[PDB]
Amino acid sequence: PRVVAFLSDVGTHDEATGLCKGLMSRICPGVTIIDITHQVPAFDVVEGALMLEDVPEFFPEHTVICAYVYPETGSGTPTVAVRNDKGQLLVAPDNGLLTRALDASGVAEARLVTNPAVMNHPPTPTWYGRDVVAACAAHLAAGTPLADVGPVVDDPVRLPDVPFTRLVGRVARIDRAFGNVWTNIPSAALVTLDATVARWPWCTTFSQVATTGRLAYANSRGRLSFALNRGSLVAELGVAPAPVEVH
Amino acid sequence: APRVVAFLSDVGTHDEATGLCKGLMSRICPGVTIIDITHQVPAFDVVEGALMLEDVPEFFPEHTVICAYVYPETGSGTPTVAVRNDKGQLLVAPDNGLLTRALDASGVAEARLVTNPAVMNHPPTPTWYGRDVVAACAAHLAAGTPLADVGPVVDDPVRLPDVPFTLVGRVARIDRAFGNVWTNIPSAAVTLDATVRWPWCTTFSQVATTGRLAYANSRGRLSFALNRGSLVAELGVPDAEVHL
Amino acid sequence: APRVVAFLSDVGTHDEATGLCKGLMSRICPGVTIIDITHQVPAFDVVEGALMLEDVPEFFPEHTVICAYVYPETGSGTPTVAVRNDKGQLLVAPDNGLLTRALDASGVAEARLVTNPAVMNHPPTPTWYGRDVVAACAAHLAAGTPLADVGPVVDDPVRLPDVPFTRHLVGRVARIDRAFGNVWTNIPSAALGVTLDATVARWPWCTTFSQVATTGRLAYANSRGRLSFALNRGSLVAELGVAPDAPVEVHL
Amino acid sequence: APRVVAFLSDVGTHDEATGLCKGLMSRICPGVTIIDITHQVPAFDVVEGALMLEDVPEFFPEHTVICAYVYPETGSGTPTVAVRNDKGQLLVAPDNGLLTRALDASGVAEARLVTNPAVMNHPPTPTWYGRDVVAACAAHLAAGTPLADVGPVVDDPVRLPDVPFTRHLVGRVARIDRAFGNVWTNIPSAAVTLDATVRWPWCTTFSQVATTGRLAYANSRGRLSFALNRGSLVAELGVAPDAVEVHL
Amino acid sequence: PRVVAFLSDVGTHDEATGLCKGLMSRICPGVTIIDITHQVPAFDVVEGALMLEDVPEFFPEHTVICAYVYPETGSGTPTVAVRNDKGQLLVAPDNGLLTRALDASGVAEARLVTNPAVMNHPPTPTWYGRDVVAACAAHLAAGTPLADVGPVVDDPVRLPDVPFTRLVGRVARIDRAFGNVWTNIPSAALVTLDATVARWPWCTTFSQVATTGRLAYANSRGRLSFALNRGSLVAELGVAPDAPVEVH
Amino acid sequence: APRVVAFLSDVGTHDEATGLCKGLMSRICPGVTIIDITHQVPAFDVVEGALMLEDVPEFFPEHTVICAYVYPETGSGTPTVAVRNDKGQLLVAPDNGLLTRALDASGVAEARLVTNPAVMNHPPTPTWYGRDVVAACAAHLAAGTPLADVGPVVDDPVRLPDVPFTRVARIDRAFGNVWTNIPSAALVTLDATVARWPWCTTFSQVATTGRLAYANSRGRLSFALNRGSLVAELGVAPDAPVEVH
Numbered sequence A: 001p002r003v004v005a006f007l008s009d010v011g012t013h014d015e016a017t018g019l020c021k022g023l024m025s026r027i028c029p030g031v032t033i034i035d036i037t038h039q040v041p042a043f044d045v046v047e048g049a050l051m052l053e054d055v056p057e058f059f060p061e062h063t064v065i066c067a068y069v070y071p072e073t074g075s076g077t078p079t080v081a082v083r084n085d086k087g088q089l090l091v092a093p094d095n096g097l098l099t100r101a102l103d104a105s106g107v108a109e110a111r112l113v114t115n116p117a118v119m120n121h122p123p124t125p126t127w128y129g130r131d132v133v134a135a136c137a138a139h140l141a142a143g144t145p146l147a148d149v150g151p152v153v154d155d156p157v158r159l160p161d162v163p164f165t166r167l168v169g170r171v172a173r174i175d176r177a178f179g180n181v182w183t184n185i186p187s188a189a190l191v192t193l194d195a196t197v198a199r200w201p202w203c204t205t206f207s208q209v210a211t212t213g214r215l216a217y218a219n220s221r222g223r224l225s226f227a228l229n230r231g232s233l234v235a236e237l238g239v240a241p242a243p244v245e246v247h
Numbered sequence B: 001a002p003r004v005v006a007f008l009s010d011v012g013t014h015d016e017a018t019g020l021c022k023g024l025m026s027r028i029c030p031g032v033t034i035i036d037i038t039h040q041v042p043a044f045d046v047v048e049g050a051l052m053l054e055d056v057p058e059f060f061p062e063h064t065v066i067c068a069y070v071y072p073e074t075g076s077g078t079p080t081v082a083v084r085n086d087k088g089q090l091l092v093a094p095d096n097g098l099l100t101r102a103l104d105a106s107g108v109a110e111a112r113l114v115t116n117p118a119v120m121n122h123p124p125t126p127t128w129y130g131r132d133v134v135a136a137c138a139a140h141l142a143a144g145t146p147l148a149d150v151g152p153v154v155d156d157p158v159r160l161p162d163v164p165f166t167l168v169g170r171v172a173r174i175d176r177a178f179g180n181v182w183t184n185i186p187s188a189a190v191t192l193d194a195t196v197r198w199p200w201c202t203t204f205s206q207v208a209t210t211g212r213l214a215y216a217n218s219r220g221r222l223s224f225a226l227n228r229g230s231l232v233a234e235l236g237v238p239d240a241e242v243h244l
Numbered sequence C: 001a002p003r004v005v006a007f008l009s010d011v012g013t014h015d016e017a018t019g020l021c022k023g024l025m026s027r028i029c030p031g032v033t034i035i036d037i038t039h040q041v042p043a044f045d046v047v048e049g050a051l052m053l054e055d056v057p058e059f060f061p062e063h064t065v066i067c068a069y070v071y072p073e074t075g076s077g078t079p080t081v082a083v084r085n086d087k088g089q090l091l092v093a094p095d096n097g098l099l100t101r102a103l104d105a106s107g108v109a110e111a112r113l114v115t116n117p118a119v120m121n122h123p124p125t126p127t128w129y130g131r132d133v134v135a136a137c138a139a140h141l142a143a144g145t146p147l148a149d150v151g152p153v154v155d156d157p158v159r160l161p162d163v164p165f166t167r168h169l170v171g172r173v174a175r176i177d178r179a180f181g182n183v184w185t186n187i188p189s190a191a192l193g194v195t196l197d198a199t200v201a202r203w204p205w206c207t208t209f210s211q212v213a214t215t216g217r218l219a220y221a222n223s224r225g226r227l228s229f230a231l232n233r234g235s236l237v238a239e240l241g242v243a244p245d246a247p248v249e250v251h252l
Numbered sequence D: 001a002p003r004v005v006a007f008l009s010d011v012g013t014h015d016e017a018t019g020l021c022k023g024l025m026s027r028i029c030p031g032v033t034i035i036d037i038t039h040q041v042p043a044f045d046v047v048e049g050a051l052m053l054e055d056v057p058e059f060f061p062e063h064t065v066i067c068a069y070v071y072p073e074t075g076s077g078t079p080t081v082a083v084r085n086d087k088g089q090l091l092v093a094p095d096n097g098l099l100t101r102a103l104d105a106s107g108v109a110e111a112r113l114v115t116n117p118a119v120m121n122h123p124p125t126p127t128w129y130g131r132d133v134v135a136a137c138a139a140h141l142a143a144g145t146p147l148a149d150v151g152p153v154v155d156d157p158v159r160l161p162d163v164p165f166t167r168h169l170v171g172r173v174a175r176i177d178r179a180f181g182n183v184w185t186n187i188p189s190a191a192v193t194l195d196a197t198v199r200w201p202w203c204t205t206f207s208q209v210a211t212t213g214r215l216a217y218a219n220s221r222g223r224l225s226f227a228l229n230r231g232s233l234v235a236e237l238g239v240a241p242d243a244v245e246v247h248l
Numbered sequence E: 001p002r003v004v005a006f007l008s009d010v011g012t013h014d015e016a017t018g019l020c021k022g023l024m025s026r027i028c029p030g031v032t033i034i035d036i037t038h039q040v041p042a043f044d045v046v047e048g049a050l051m052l053e054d055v056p057e058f059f060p061e062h063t064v065i066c067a068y069v070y071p072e073t074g075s076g077t078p079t080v081a082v083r084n085d086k087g088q089l090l091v092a093p094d095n096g097l098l099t100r101a102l103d104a105s106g107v108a109e110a111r112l113v114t115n116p117a118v119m120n121h122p123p124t125p126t127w128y129g130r131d132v133v134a135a136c137a138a139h140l141a142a143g144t145p146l147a148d149v150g151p152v153v154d155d156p157v158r159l160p161d162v163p164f165t166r167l168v169g170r171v172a173r174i175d176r177a178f179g180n181v182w183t184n185i186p187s188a189a190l191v192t193l194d195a196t197v198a199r200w201p202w203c204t205t206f207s208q209v210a211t212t213g214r215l216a217y218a219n220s221r222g223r224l225s226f227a228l229n230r231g232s233l234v235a236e237l238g239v240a241p242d243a244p245v246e247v248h
Numbered sequence F: 001a002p003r004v005v006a007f008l009s010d011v012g013t014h015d016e017a018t019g020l021c022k023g024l025m026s027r028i029c030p031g032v033t034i035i036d037i038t039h040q041v042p043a044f045d046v047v048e049g050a051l052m053l054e055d056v057p058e059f060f061p062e063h064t065v066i067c068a069y070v071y072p073e074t075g076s077g078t079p080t081v082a083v084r085n086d087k088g089q090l091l092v093a094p095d096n097g098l099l100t101r102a103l104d105a106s107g108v109a110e111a112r113l114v115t116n117p118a119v120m121n122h123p124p125t126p127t128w129y130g131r132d133v134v135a136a137c138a139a140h141l142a143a144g145t146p147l148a149d150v151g152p153v154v155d156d157p158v159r160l161p162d163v164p165f166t167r168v169a170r171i172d173r174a175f176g177n178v179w180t181n182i183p184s185a186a187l188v189t190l191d192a193t194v195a196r197w198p199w200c201t202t203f204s205q206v207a208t209t210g211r212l213a214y215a216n217s218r219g220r221l222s223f224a225l226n227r228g229s230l231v232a233e234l235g236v237a238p239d240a241p242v243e244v245h
């Protein structure tokens, strides 16, 4: 069975995610479920799409990426299942949540989830995430052919992007464990930096500047980022996922 | 072959404790699968955990042990109980009623008190029976230890009381991720005149953004919500009538 | 076959990062079991993580890799160390002392520095060695890569210092039970020897919480054997406003 | 000379209690006229009494004391307040907001707390301040005791909150005419047929529609109301107070 | 000032009757208002007419009888004011409510109430009872000449009667405090009675028969009545007003 | 000059009868003030009315006539009695004991039987002596007719019996409060059968819906629920047993 990677905005504070996992193990006995996160802010599709970008790279090809942020649950908004160029399967509401992950790994095939046999038979309109997305992810992980899921659709719904302009960018995400600030400006779109978020030393890593000192760097994904060594730059500057311009 | 262990407690995820319980389980039952239901039950809150455990029997396989401990009585006269339900799933929890709703949903086919040291973690620490009795017994059962080896038959596990609806009810739980409000009134008991006009909806998106709505939640109980908003935040509303 | 990987970090659960580490581990070691110890270690806090890792060797099987990273030194001269203990468990962590208490509890039978690129994630990102060195090495070891292939022998992993308790008994609040508000000290209960006169009042010495009235104060030996103070069904930290490293005196 | 005393409470008419209050008043103020407004306020229901007291200032002379007590706080820290309004009428009630609507209609020219024992019934029984403070003070004021002798100035009497109507028009059934079954809302009529949730013909009076027929109108106070001609709309629709949307 | 005797179907459960009394005291300071009753069943003109029959006899000549049961309020149905042979004044809607009272005391003069000066200047169509009937009763009690009220009308509107026939009649009213049954058959139209409502002992008063025993008598008004001694005959027999009664 | 007439009966307010009595009184005594005590006494219930009349003498002026009639004996050998008490108030009622508690509280200074037709309503209807004897006599006395003109001296008005407490009288029907015949001075918490009852100054010293024990306005031990009906909760009716442990 495929490994199921699991993301949602439902949380860990009660039984709901656990019930989804139990349903998956019911459908696919012996399945491995790795949580990516369930702390996506409520209704926040863009945040989840950002969190899912690298998931295809760092998971095996024998994977189902199960993700649901679904304020459209129980409406005309269907669930989409996708095979990418890596050969991984992806299941999510067709509201664009898979946008960045699909840009990174490609769309080799995409169908709408309409076959009741891959659903949890009484799909509750308020919890399609469990009864359609999770159940379909488990059925696919068990080896159900993607073609059985429903009709081909040309392209999954896609989120829009306001890229950086040559430089002017934006704070895309904040490292909430540490206070580090990430931008959408790729570092290759270039030692010190004059930037508005002041002179920022360009560093390999955090510890090349004194403790509490400011620093600029390329994060794990390759995008320009700002930080304080052993400190929270967000806390100091009060910045929220804002501006950014490299002079 | 080993059962899947479903794991609930009020101990948390902020340090090693739950991880140590899981390591102990894997020591007792190598190759065991442990699915967390949640460990964010508010401290000492048995009723909250019982509410969270109600649907767990339905949505887990029959080859399951439900390991749950909310145990302010740990290291006292209050024993640990192990149960086989009508689905054939095993359940392990302190005999303080925490299994009440789960047992109402799935039945009591057999129940024994956990007294045999061979299913315990030999130096059971009085302050952490949850690990040394409940978790160790759940792992031994998952490994295939017969329930009869666990200790003496007891007629009924201790049960929590309920104040049902009369329509008058209470807010049973709040969806803490979203702010949705759940009641104990079954929907089987269009608009609603209610004290907490609410449009009766299939789902959240049948009303404008920030709009109020009434519906039947996943479990079938009347619930109130704001579309893409927190009704709890708006109304400041658990334990807090539908006019006909 | 594969070892169980026990996983600790200060990176969190609020986004994809820990999940990406787990996916990398499953890529390196298919069919691996990953048990989270915790990922809520306060940022940069090596001492807190070392305290959290002390009992991990005892309560995990011998066929285990303990993968832990709290790494404000990531991408610097500070290497990653891999250790075999007397229980035969493997441990992988930055060589900044994070493994100190775990190693005191289970011993150092062998320790090497992680320098071989074949056990790393080939483009190791300097800001995330925790993923690209620590996690990848933990997965390769769990898959059965010999520890000797990891790099050069080093005599002793870097060790954290300790300020133990003294007899006048004066120690400190080591940790606080953040779920419950219970207060833990570094004073072993066996140093004591029913009620306690202590500065943190008279504290009844109890087997467990429920031997005192609800909201009542109590003293006891916690799961690890160290003197602890609590309120029955209450938060002693909340009542007394105590935070970790605060002084504690046991009057004799 | 003496003021007319208008008398409201939730104590009832089924036994001697209201009569004993009236006797006490006549003891304090011989020759006083006591007109009952009502004593059938539902028990502990301050909001209902405040609604019932709104028009009382308009339809009584200026030489009046409005004596009202709904007092689940009797014998506690909750004092009794005495008020002079812009009409020059006096008002006596527990300072729990019961005078809210009456005061909004007639104004607060002066307000003091009743603390002087000389205007009280000397052994004030904690369970019946309504008699021993409110009624006795109303009688002493009706006899001509200066309001300033009653106790200390207080800036504003305690006031009940209101959830008014909103233009989307959504309001509530404020009161029901319990003699007839007519339904009153908080929507002023100043805010022909009506599309409403509770088609309603808009009428001058009840008899412009067939017997048992539905009708919408502006009641005596000017607020939108619904009724059945020679019938109980409450009985037909099962509507209770605090339950109205007017579609425009 | 005249004594005002006050009857309506509005009730005592809220402020309405009290507001009418306050209006009367505004118009006529120092006026005495005696309630006859305000528990007339809603819209029930016949019941009120029955209740008003003896009112002229048992009140002084210096009286205004103010009565309103007014489902026709705010319509073409005016208010009538009457002087009877006793010299008492009467004010009521011209829908027949004064029928029995007028049969007992006579019509010496009757006018329609049309002069705005005896009305409450903004007469609310839904509450003429207050703004016309009560205000006119108060103005008359203050000494306003009846001729100022409006135009002479020959006869007030009168209710019809289905009298008893030689003997057969009906249950006219039930004593709702006690369960006693009253008929329209005068006792002088007749020791024991064979009657359908059984042999009924003919008694001076209730206590001439055993407790719970049946009895026949002439009530205070002189009409044949049936009762149970210390019991409710209505409760036993389930009889409601208008039900036939036959004396054999 | 005329006395205030305080008026109690079991006849009711649902029709004209009480109003006709008041009109008769105003005919006899012009300018008289009539204060209703109550007319909702349960039918034929003399004991209930006697309980309701106990405090009436205290809280009314001395220049008063207390007119009360609960009269299932109307038009029989049972006469009407008129009384002057030690406060100097006059009282008129059927001589069936209805004045018992009021007289115990205020005393009997003089008592006569009402037999003089000049203080009656000349055609006294046997079924309504309450109007034609009791009310008319109350009005004539209020007008200043000497009590001695009313009829013959009688030594003691008929008196109701009492079963006192030994070492539930009424229920507050507006609120559900329970009153006993045990004086509070025959005594912080109470062990009682009607549970531990907190002894309170007033209702609001206990949580909403909470039980409480106290001394009512008259000084007798009483039980209540704060903002609730204790009668409704416990289904207790008057005369039911109570014991203080």
Ligand SMILES: Nc1ccnc2c1ncn2[C@@H]1O[C@H](CO)[C@@H](O)[C@H]1O
Pocket (backbone or CB within 6 Å): A009, A010, A042, A043, A068, A069, A070, A071, A072, A073, A126, A127, A128, A129, A130, B178, B180, B204, B205, B225, B226, B227, B228, B229
């Ligand atoms: N009040 C709400 C409004 C809109 N969506 C909600 C609400 N509550 C829960 N949800 C959504 O329901 C989904 C369940 O499939 C979750 O992904 C969540 O985003």
Ligand SMILES: Nc1ccnc2c1ncn2[C@@H]1O[C@H](CO)[C@@H](O)[C@H]1O
Pocket (backbone or CB within 6 Å): B010, B011, B043, B044, B069, B070, B071, B072, B073, B074, B127, B128, B129, B130, B131, C180, C182, C209, C210, C230, C231, C232, C233, C234
């Ligand atoms: N201060 C405390 C008082 C009562 N129970 C506690 C306390 N701290 C931890 N516990 C309980 O100990 C249990 C360990 O088995 C936990 O389930 C938890 O509820």
Ligand SMILES: Nc1ccnc2c1ncn2[C@@H]1O[C@H](CO)[C@@H](O)[C@H]1O
Pocket (backbone or CB within 6 Å): A178, A180, A206, A207, A227, A228, A229, A230, A231, C010, C011, C043, C044, C069, C070, C071, C072, C073, C074, C127, C128, C129, C130, C131
């Ligand atoms: N701003 C920062 C300063 C120092 N260390 C950081 C910072 N942000 C993340 N880290 C560290 O990077 C490590 C990644 O291997 C994490 O363990 C974390 O402690």
Ligand SMILES: Nc1ccnc2c1ncn2[C@@H]1O[C@H](CO)[C@@H](O)[C@H]1O
Pocket (backbone or CB within 6 Å): D010, D011, D043, D044, D069, D070, D071, D072, D073, D074, D127, D128, D129, D130, D131, F175, F177, F203, F204, F224, F225, F226, F227, F228
């Ligand atoms: N059981 C009760 C609880 C609270 N208030 C009460 C209770 N019984 C009577 N009262 C109040 O006492 C007041 C007497 O001043 C009345 O207005 C009434 O509202």
Ligand SMILES: Nc1ccnc2c1ncn2[C@@H]1O[C@H](CO)[C@@H](O)[C@H]1O
Pocket (backbone or CB within 6 Å): D180, D182, D206, D207, D227, D228, D229, D230, D231, E009, E010, E042, E043, E068, E069, E070, E071, E072, E073, E126, E127, E128, E129, E130
């Ligand atoms: N719904 C109604 C229909 C007809 N008459 C009414 C209605 N409500 C009140 N009234 C009448 O209005 C009169 C007010 O003058 C009252 O006498 C009463 O009978």
Ligand SMILES: Nc1ccnc2c1ncn2[C@@H]1O[C@H](CO)[C@@H](O)[C@H]1O
Pocket (backbone or CB within 6 Å): E178, E180, E206, E207, E227, E228, E229, E230, E231, F010, F011, F043, F044, F069, F070, F071, F072, F073, F074, F127, F128, F129, F130, F131
């Ligand atoms: N059916 C009845 C039996 C006995 N007494 C009655 C009955 N009906 C009325 N009465 C009494 O007649 C009295 C009139 O004086 C009232 O006080 C009342 O108690």
